[PDB]
Amino acid sequence: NYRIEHDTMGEVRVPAKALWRAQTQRAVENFPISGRGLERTQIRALGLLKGACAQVNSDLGLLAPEKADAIIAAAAEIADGQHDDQFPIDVFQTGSGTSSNMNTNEVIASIAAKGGVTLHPNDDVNMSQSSNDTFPTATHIAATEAAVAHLIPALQQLHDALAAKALDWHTVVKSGRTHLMDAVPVTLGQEFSGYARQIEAGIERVRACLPRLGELAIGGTAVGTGLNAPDDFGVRVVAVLVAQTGLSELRTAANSFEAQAARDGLVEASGALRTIAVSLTKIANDIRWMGSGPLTGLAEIQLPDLKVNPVLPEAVTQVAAQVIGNDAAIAWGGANGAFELNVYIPMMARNILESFKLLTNVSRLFAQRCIAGLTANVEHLRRLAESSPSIVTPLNSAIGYEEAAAVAKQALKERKTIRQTVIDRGLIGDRLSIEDLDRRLDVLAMAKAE
Amino acid sequence: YRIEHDTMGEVRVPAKALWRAQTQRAVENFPISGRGLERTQIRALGLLKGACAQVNSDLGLLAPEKADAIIAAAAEIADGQHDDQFPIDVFQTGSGTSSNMNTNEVIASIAAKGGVTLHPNDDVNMSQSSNDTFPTATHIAATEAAVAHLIPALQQLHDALAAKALDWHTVVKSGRTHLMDAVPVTLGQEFSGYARQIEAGIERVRACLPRLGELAIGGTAVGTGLNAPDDFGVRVVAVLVAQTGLSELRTAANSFEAQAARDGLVEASGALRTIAVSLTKIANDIRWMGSGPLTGLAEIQLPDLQPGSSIMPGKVNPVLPEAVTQVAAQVIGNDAAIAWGGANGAFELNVYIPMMARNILESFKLLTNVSRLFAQRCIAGLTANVEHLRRLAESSPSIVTPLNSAIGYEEAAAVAKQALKERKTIRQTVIDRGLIGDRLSIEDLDRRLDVLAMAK
Amino acid sequence: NYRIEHDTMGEVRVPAKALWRAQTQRAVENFPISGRGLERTQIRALGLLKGACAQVNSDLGLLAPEKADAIIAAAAEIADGQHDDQFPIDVFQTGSGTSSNMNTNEVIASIAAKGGVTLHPNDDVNMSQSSNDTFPTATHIAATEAAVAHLIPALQQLHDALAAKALDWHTVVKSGRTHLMDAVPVTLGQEFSGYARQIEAGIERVRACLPRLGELAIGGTAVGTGLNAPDDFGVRVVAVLVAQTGLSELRTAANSFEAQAARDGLVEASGALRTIAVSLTKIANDIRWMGSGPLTGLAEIQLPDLQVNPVLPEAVTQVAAQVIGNDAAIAWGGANGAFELNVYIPMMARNILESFKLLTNVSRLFAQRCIAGLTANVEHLRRLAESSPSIVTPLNSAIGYEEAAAVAKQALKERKTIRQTVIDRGLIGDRLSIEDLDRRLDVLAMAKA
Amino acid sequence: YRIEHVRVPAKALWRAQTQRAVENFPISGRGLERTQIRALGLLKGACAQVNSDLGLLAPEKADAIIAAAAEIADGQHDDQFPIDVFQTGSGTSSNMNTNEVIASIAAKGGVTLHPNDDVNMSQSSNDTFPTATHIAATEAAVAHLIPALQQLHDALAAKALDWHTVVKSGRTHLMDAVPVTLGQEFSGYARQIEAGIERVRACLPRLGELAIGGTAVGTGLNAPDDFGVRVVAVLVAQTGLSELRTAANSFEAQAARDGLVEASGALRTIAVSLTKIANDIRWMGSGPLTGLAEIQLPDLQPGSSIMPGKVNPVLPEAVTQVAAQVIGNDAAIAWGGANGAFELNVYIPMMARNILESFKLLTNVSRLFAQRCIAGLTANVEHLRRLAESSPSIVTPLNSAIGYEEAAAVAKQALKERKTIRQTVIDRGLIGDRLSIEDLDRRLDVLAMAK
């Protein structure tokens, strides 16, 4: 079953029950590429932004109250997720997001028609707007919400789990490893204090990009000049959005031309996500190597079972690879704007929103189902600390580097302890007493735990 | 929702679900992306399980009634009848063990409906490991995507560009180097260049097939083939080749390399990334040639596909070139993810397979679909502004050089300067300056300024 | 021809005139890979750091004044660039930079020997140090100096050149272009205000990474515990470095383990550089397209002649490609640390310092030799503004989008102006007077400058 | 010191146009590499030869160019190319640099040459610079990289053979797995390198395509119609590089650099394989006492300035750092490759720098890795076999004799008492009528399990 709809290019056959109209149906036929459309968070931001625009147009007396009420009601239904099946357009559509903007306009007009209100998708639902300012605004609203309300709390949860282990394992001495080779002692707590700082630095990196990620193009209309919008449209809409979302990070753009010609805020934010992926790869790799074996590996810690494969470190490192790939796609799209508009917005939006979701979800899972339940093999870790030939290092000031190197070489060759080799080489005397040797070779004291 | 009793405890599974306890545990363990295996991956897993059951039956290791049940169930999966029965996230255990168990459980639940009891591990996973099966299904899917879908889509795009190269063989225009006016070319010569880039793309995909088609099946847990028949891999591949017609599928040259690394996926992604680079150039040139109507280059007219703007009435945009360049960006990004996963294998197993499979199979799908749309909805309907193109070519200071031997460097530069000033052709400027005479006839001038001859 | 030197692995033949010793010579033979060694800025930071360590060891009474004076004098000579030919080790060496650290120790010992002072490269010149804290410290000193003293001033120069054009061309009306297609009017000044903001945002992005790029590992020694160093070594050395360089951005690391196990500060900083490269690509591309033709292109502006091919926009876009490549190498190395040490430091250092240098140098050249001298084709730009059928857009509130679309389509088909098509379609009346039509279709007023 | 033409250094063989490019592009401070300069010399000599053959260039002028160009190709004037890599995107500046240096060399021999009219006869920079880039890249692949990879392959294959029976436990997900041999693992690494050589050989049909003869836009205007085929014939005869050919399509050959992007993909895959091989080797060599200690790498230098006697896996570290650089260079190459416009891709100097560096780094590090690391590796045979014989993963073949429950009990006790599975079976008194000592040694034969 089908019905006839029309646009300025002509008549289009639209499925009888569909709430979208002619322009969405053209886009369905023009872009069957990935088979995936906008995400729930994108549809929510478009619905929120359409409702805020109707409210401001109503406040400025440009749109009749009956029409504004119809738009606001329909836009609220869309934002709440009651019509996600009415957004069938592929991500890989026209680069401005024109087709998804018209999808929102057409669906609102159809919802309002059911309520007995006639709205023109362009003249009423899109009053004072363009896709050029609306689609990147909805993208930056979704990205800012993902960063502030989801990713930062997830990272804070992971930071707190790592910090709890840094405290619990403060004196769990082990051998440090540099270049994968036996080094001087460290504590498992000190290593986890390093992982915790990497995550805290990640939170700082996300926060540092919010002044530009939260910049919205709304009000710039077609090219940034604000033509066909009231001069204070942007400031008024952003105030409505801040009041409704509670996201004080949302702001009008510093420059209305930069806000539409470029998507540099998304490139910057993806760089912060890419850095988080890089830190997470190091943390997850160290954790699966510490849990490796038991017989053929390091067997330093035991990971919670979900013979235990390190499944959450594998999920983490796979997510990090995806974030790195997504980051390359975002920068490629970001560089290729032309004149008044960057036309890679739907692709850049897919990738940045995906990177926020993956990092948010895998960070919470890693914290709760892997980090929280880790157990240390305390006796084995102490034995490893004591067996490194590099424990000879604190003797450098007493016997010199060259003699200390001869001690380590001989201890390994003769299968003797460093302490015994120092004694055997006749190094005990005025420069090093037996009591000093024993103080210097104490592995926990050698870790200099705070 | 029905309740299933496992070795650890109790677990609730949706009533209409054909998966069982192990899949439901993986659903609860990995809520990361909310996206599971794609249709092509599910099909390849179904194909592989059917071929394994066939070989276990042939070798007398599996009872014929059990083998027939697996084959019938696996054919339903390969036919795309159960794409809603694979709920596990892409971001799972790196070997793809969870998706391998999902396939075994779904097959057992399908066979149970037919009144045959199957053990997911002992029967459906007989002679197999996930470490050899999941990368095998990935390489089957990738080989099928290359041979049966991408190469024909690129061939369609090549033929559309080559048709324009022929139709516009004599459509002379000015060349552009560094974006500046250059000596004449034809639009057909430019489109012959684009057709060659796509032909080279097909050659690049064909070049990776000897290694993309290598399958790990039979190598079991670490590549040694322990707990599998010694000829399990050769027999399974022979069945797969006979059923699918994919002659590129083969047992791996080295069973350890085939599980420790996924270098064939990295190589194939390189070919897709080069195609994305070529398509970026072709699409960018096309949208620039179609720019306007009055403030751009206006060399060609693209077919109108939809209204261009919600605010600027009557505007129409190059939407298919934009979809092509956005797909290319995605392929470049997917390619970086694939290489990252490929480098980070350890010892006997590379544990980035589900992420690498997602990315390479998506790149194949996006390129296939956008190349066909680009050919059909854009290239096929392009029209050239022939008179405009020839007039610019005939007005170019770049074509004064053949006058030098008749009127001199200084007068040819004066002709070039006046033509630009009066917006006239070089030919009319020569006539206006009264240069036609004994030294230069009108016939000699038209030979010297023959722009189509200059394009060769 | 050669002399014998030794280390804990044995005797090594070293060129007779070379100031380096056994361990540098082993590294010369182990790593002939790229044929390129440390840059002048890296050798300067290593020399500065070695001198600061000797000063603090002397202040704490751990190193005799004669030996400390000899190290400080030799380290100053190295920092000033008097011995760069004595640093022959490849960039692609052991991942901690052990070989370049021993190169600095050995060269200082040889310089001091000429002055009659015997120094042991490990026991004296490397007292309280490790390559694990020294090489990333020297890298982060060089990177912070590159950002603060070179890149930010270069970007400010480019910002000021772009801003000057935004002001000079404030009312130079032209047609906006979206999707490469005719759009509504803009001014050339407005577009350049956009480019200027991209560069200002780039400066903000660099400044935002300085709290972590300026973090130094110095004092953490082998693994971050500070073993074999005084407990306040790092704080004391950083104070000396801040006093000598004037770089208040240099600080002790928040966590000594993170500072050696990872190089996330360099990954973060490279992300800022990559974003600058992305902005520069857009600016340079718009500028070469505006100068394209003349006959076959847009012919909006004239670029200054230097070799007119847009040679500086080509240099800019090539540098941006290199920064994007370098950024991928840096992130790859950054992710692959293990346990107490990330062993990709010499590769990450090469790439980040190169990205800072290329962006600094190409930004100054682009500002001075391209942007400053641009000239606008004012009459042609006005004609372009007036010819876009999208100038029908301000009539949407009077005649509606659908009728405005019919106007644009008819004006293009009949080769008529939008004004004439509105008149011809009989749209003048109560909803639109001729005086309103003329106010709405004025292209400069339409740009809302 | 300085000479005027603009001031040019006295000992410089370049002239005014090169000096202007020096002043115009102070960006990186690095110019053309030796291989690029050589390819430009080869190309200019071959062009002069063909112009002479076709009677377009006087023999005295042609002989002067050929002699000068051979000096450049022989690497006698690598200090005469001062122009930055980051120059005009066509490489016009470096093309003029070559023409001016040739004219200054010929002037010393008493022959006057016009850099443009004689040395650049029948040419454009738009066809010559990418031609010299593809010659250099083809030579780097065929004459240097493939032989270096073959050396590395042969070193890994020698270890695959020497350690054919060195049984050890496999590792999957970093966890204990069924037995393998160190020779089987090294056979996998050798295959990765052999597949790397196949990948490089697969890109040669397109890497070797040359634009020469296409002139400014690919039409061949102002060149003889057979200029390209004649120049390539001379280049192939002189160099022996049979992979060099005229391009399939003259427009694609100048509008795009897709052959460089394809070749960089092959180098990036080699970097990915080398990362896996080098990481496994440094992990197998980890220790001496807190790591895996499966193998011993040859000592190449003292490991630490502070930890005495420590020795590190420096060659694997150089290999993984080169791989990171190749990945980065590959992203820069693809970026440049996509951004051509109409008749010319203007990212050639940047793409050439990156691809030629990737070839050089991979060549040099593969030879060092083979010679200074792989060749001298030693296996800890007894340690490897003891761990394999103590693995719970080898109890599965006991199931048919003693049952799943008793085999798991054997596995649990072996781990508890740090004994082999064999000794644990004997200690639990499982040897009898059901299971003889001969049957037990057949069931627990770890080398047979590795097949």
Find the DSSP H helices in A214-310.
233-245, 258-261, 264-290
Of B34, B91, B351, the CB nearest to A319: B91
Of A96, A317, A362, the CB nearest to B344: A317
Residue D366 appears among annotated catalytic residues: no
For chain A, the chains sharing at least 3 beta-carbon pairs closer than 8 angstroms are B, C, D
Judged on CB neighbours under 10 Å (0-12, 13-18, 19+), A115 is exposed
Cα–Cα distance for residue pair B348/B254, rounded to 1 Å: 12
Q: What sign has the CA pseudo-torsion A53, A54, A55, A57?
A: positive
For domain C3-129, the CATH superfamily is Fumarase/aspartase (N-terminal domain) (1.10.275.10)
Name the DSSP class of B224: S
Grouping H, G, I as helix, E, B as strand and the rest as coil, residue D58 is: coil
Contact call for residues B46 and B78 (beta carbons, < 8 A) = yes
Interface test with D, best of A174, A180, A402 (most D CBs within 10 A): A180
Q: What sign has the CA pseudo-torsion C249, C255, C257, C263?
A: negative
Cα–Cα distance for residue pair C360/A257, rounded to 1 Å: 25
Of B295, B307, B420, the CB nearest to C182: B295
What the block records as the tokens of B87 is 């709920």
Judged on CB neighbours under 10 Å (0-12, 13-18, 19+), B175 is buried
Interface test with B, best of C175, C181, C336, C417 (most B CBs within 10 A): C181
Judged on CB neighbours under 10 Å (0-12, 13-18, 19+), A90 is buried
D24 contact residues in C (CB cutoff 8 A): 306-307, 311, 369
DSSP for A389-437, please give it.
Answer: GGGGGGGHHHH-HHHHHHHHHHHHHHT--HHHHHHHTT--BTTB-HHHH
What the block records as the tokens of B80 is 């795309």
Of B179, B296, B392, the CB nearest to C181: B296
- Architecture of domain D3-123 in this structure: Orthogonal Bundle (1.10)
Distances (CA, A) of D352 to C317, C330, D84: 15, 21, 13
Cβ contact, residue pair A295, D174, below 8 Å: no
Judged on CB neighbours under 10 Å (0-12, 13-18, 19+), B243 is middle
Domain boundaries, chain C: 3-129, 130-390, 391-446
Cα–Cα distance for residue pair B210/B206, rounded to 1 Å: 8
Question: This structure's resolution (angstroms)?
Answer: 1.6
Q: Are strands D209-210 and D245-246 parallel, antiparallel or unpaired?
A: parallel
The owner of tokens 């420790």 is B260
Q: Which long-range contacts (CB under 8 A, 24 or more apart) does D220-224 make?
A: D220/B456, D220/D250, D221/B183, D221/B454, D221/B455, D221/B456, D222/B401, D222/D122, D222/D124, D223/D122, D223/D123, D224/D50, D224/D54, D224/D56, D224/D122
Establish whether the linkage from the previous residue to A294 is cis, with ω within 30° of 0.
yes
Q: Which residue positions of C form the known binding site for substrate?
A: 96-98, 120-123, 130-132, 178, 308-309
What the block records as the tokens of D309 is 């006697």
Cβ contact, residue pair D290, A177, below 8 Å: yes
Cα–Cα distance for residue pair D143/D138, rounded to 1 Å: 8
Cα–Cα distance for residue pair A176/A197, rounded to 1 Å: 18
Establish whether the linkage from the previous residue to B293 is cis, with ω within 30° of 0.
yes
- What would you report as the CA-atom Rg of chain D, rounded to the nearest whole angstrom? 30
Instruction: Just give the CATH number of D394-449.
Output: 1.10.40.30
Task: Give strand pairing partners of A432.
Answer: A429
Q: List the helix and strand counts (H, then E) for chain B.
A: 18, 8
Cα–Cα distance for residue pair C180/D184, rounded to 1 Å: 58
**Whose CA is closest to A137, among A233, A39, A247, A238?**
A238
Cα–Cα distance for residue pair A73/A76, rounded to 1 Å: 5
In single-letter form, the type of residue at position A282 comes to K
Grouping H, G, I as helix, E, B as strand and the rest as coil, residue C12 is: strand
D104 is in an annotated binding site: no
Q: Which residue positions of C form the known binding site?
A: 96-98, 120-123, 130-132, 178, 308-309
End-to-end C-alpha distance for chain A, whole angstroms = 74
Grouping H, G, I as helix, E, B as strand and the rest as coil, residue A257 is: coil
Instruction: Just give the CATH number of B2-128.
Output: 1.10.275.10
D372 contact residues in C (CB cutoff 8 A): 30
Those residues whose C-beta lies under 8 Å from the C-beta of residue A383, and which sit 6 or more positions away, are none
Judged on CB neighbours under 10 Å (0-12, 13-18, 19+), C164 is middle
**Whose CA is closest to A216, among A181, A245, A254, A184?**
A254
What the block records as the tokens of C35 is 């044929």
Cβ contact, residue pair C182, B293, below 8 Å: yes
Q: Are strands D245-246 and B10-13 parallel, antiparallel or unpaired?
A: unpaired
Chain D residues whose C-beta sits inside 8 Å of any chain A C-beta: 169, 171, 173-176, 282-283, 285-292, 302-304, 306-313, 317, 331, 335, 387, 390-392, 415
3-state secondary structure B374-390: HHHHCHHHCEECHHHHH
In single-letter form, the type of residue at position A12 comes to V
Cβ contact, residue pair C332, B340, below 8 Å: yes
D125 is in an annotated binding site: yes
For chain D, the chains sharing at least 3 beta-carbon pairs closer than 8 angstroms are A, B, C
Those residues whose C-beta lies under 8 Å from the C-beta of residue D188, and which sit 6 or more positions away, are B223, B254, B256, B257, B260, B261
Q: What sign has the CA pseudo-torsion C420, C422, C424, C429?
A: negative
A115 is in an annotated binding site: no
The alpha-carbon gap from B229 to the nearest alpha carbon of chain C, in Å, equals 39
What the block records as the tokens of B99 is 């998706």
Cα–Cα distance for residue pair B397/C12, rounded to 1 Å: 68
Those residues whose C-beta lies under 8 Å from the C-beta of residue D225, and which sit 6 or more positions away, are none
Contact call for residues B137 and B78 (beta carbons, < 8 A) = no
D336 contact residues in B (CB cutoff 8 A): none
What the block records as the tokens of B418 is 């006046």
The owner of tokens 């280049």 is D235
Cα–Cα distance for residue pair B164/B187, rounded to 1 Å: 8
State which approach was used to obtain the coordinates: X-ray
Cα–Cα distance for residue pair B174/B133, rounded to 1 Å: 56
Cα–Cα distance for residue pair A421/C35, rounded to 1 Å: 42
Helix (H) or strand (E) run with residue A302 in it: strand A301-302
Name the DSSP class of B303: P
Distances (CA, A) of C145 to C151, C153, C259, C423: 9, 12, 18, 65
Contact call for residues B366 and A329 (beta carbons, < 8 A) = no
What the block records as the tokens of D444 is 């627990």
**Whose CA is closest to C214, among C272, C133, C269, C273?**
C269
Cα–Cα distance for residue pair A207/C208, rounded to 1 Å: 10
Contact call for residues B245 and D241 (beta carbons, < 8 A) = no
Those residues whose C-beta lies under 8 Å from the C-beta of residue C305, and which sit 6 or more positions away, are none
Angle between helices B130-144 and B263-289 (to 10 degrees): 30
Distances (CA, A) of C432 to C416, C420, C422, C436: 19, 14, 10, 6
Cβ contact, residue pair A93, B313, below 8 Å: no
Find the DSSP H helices in D166-226.
182-207
**Whose CA is closest to D57, among D98, D12, D106, D128?**
D106
C289 contact residues in A (CB cutoff 8 A): 338-339
Those residues whose C-beta lies under 8 Å from the C-beta of residue B76, and which sit 6 or more positions away, are B46, B82, B110
Contact call for residues A355 and A326 (beta carbons, < 8 A) = yes
Cβ contact, residue pair D178, B224, below 8 Å: yes
The alpha-carbon gap from A149 to the nearest alpha carbon of chain C, in Å, equals 22
Name the DSSP class of C92: S
Those residues whose C-beta lies under 8 Å from the C-beta of residue C64, and which sit 6 or more positions away, are none
The owner of tokens 């076959």 is C296
Cα–Cα distance for residue pair C12/B3, rounded to 1 Å: 74
Grouping H, G, I as helix, E, B as strand and the rest as coil, residue D296 is: strand
Cβ contact, residue pair A311, B338, below 8 Å: no
Q: What sign has the CA pseudo-torsion C38, C39, C43, C48?
A: negative
Cα–Cα distance for residue pair C282/A70, rounded to 1 Å: 41
**Whose CA is closest to C225, among C105, C137, C133, C131?**
C133
The owner of tokens 């427009």 is D251
C-alpha atoms less than 13 angstroms from C-alpha of D67 in its C-beta half-sphere? 16
Name the DSSP class of B17: -
Helix (H) or strand (E) run with residue C13 in it: strand C10-15
Contact call for residues D41 and D70 (beta carbons, < 8 A) = yes
Grouping H, G, I as helix, E, B as strand and the rest as coil, residue A175 is: strand
Query: Out of 3.30.360.10, 2.40.40.20, 1.20.58.60, 1.20.200.10, which CATH number does the structure's domain D124-393 have?
Result: 1.20.200.10
CA A178 from centre of chain: 29
A168 is in an annotated binding site: no
Q: List the helix and strand counts (H, then E) for chain A.
A: 18, 8
Active-site residue list of B: 178, 309
Task: Give strand pairing partners of B173.
Answer: B185
> Torsion angle, CA of B99/B101/B104/B106, rounded to 10 degrees?
-70
3-state secondary structure D412-425: HHHHHHCCCHHHHH
Name the DSSP class of D298: P
Cβ contact, residue pair B179, C409, below 8 Å: no
Domains A130-390 and A391-446 equal at CATH topology level: no
Name the DSSP class of A89: -
The owner of tokens 């099928």 is B144
For domain B129-398, the CATH superfamily is Fumarase/aspartase (Central domain) (1.20.200.10)
**Whose CA is closest to C50, among C34, C26, C67, C35?**
C67
The alpha-carbon gap from C80 to the nearest alpha carbon of chain A, in Å, equals 29
**Whose CA is closest to D206, among D138, D152, D273, D139?**
D138
Contact call for residues B134 and B96 (beta carbons, < 8 A) = yes
- Architecture of domain B399-454 in this structure: Orthogonal Bundle (1.10)
Distances (CA, A) of D38 to A401, D35, D143, D239, D362: 48, 5, 14, 11, 20
Q: What sign has the CA pseudo-torsion B125, B126, B130, B136?
A: negative
Grouping H, G, I as helix, E, B as strand and the rest as coil, residue C274 is: helix
Contact call for residues D67 and D109 (beta carbons, < 8 A) = yes
**Whose CA is closest to B131, among B271, B268, B252, B266?**
B252
Fold of the domain built from segment(s) C130-390? Fumarase C; Chain A, domain 2 (1.20.200)
Contact call for residues C201 and C193 (beta carbons, < 8 A) = no
Cα–Cα distance for residue pair A111/A120, rounded to 1 Å: 12
**Whose CA is closest to C228, among C105, C62, C364, C361?**
C62
**Whose CA is closest to B357, among B99, B124, B170, B173?**
B99
For domain A391-446, the CATH superfamily is Fumarase/aspartase (C-terminal domain) (1.10.40.30)
Residue D173 appears among annotated catalytic residues: yes
Q: List the helix and strand counts (H, then E) for chain C.
A: 18, 8
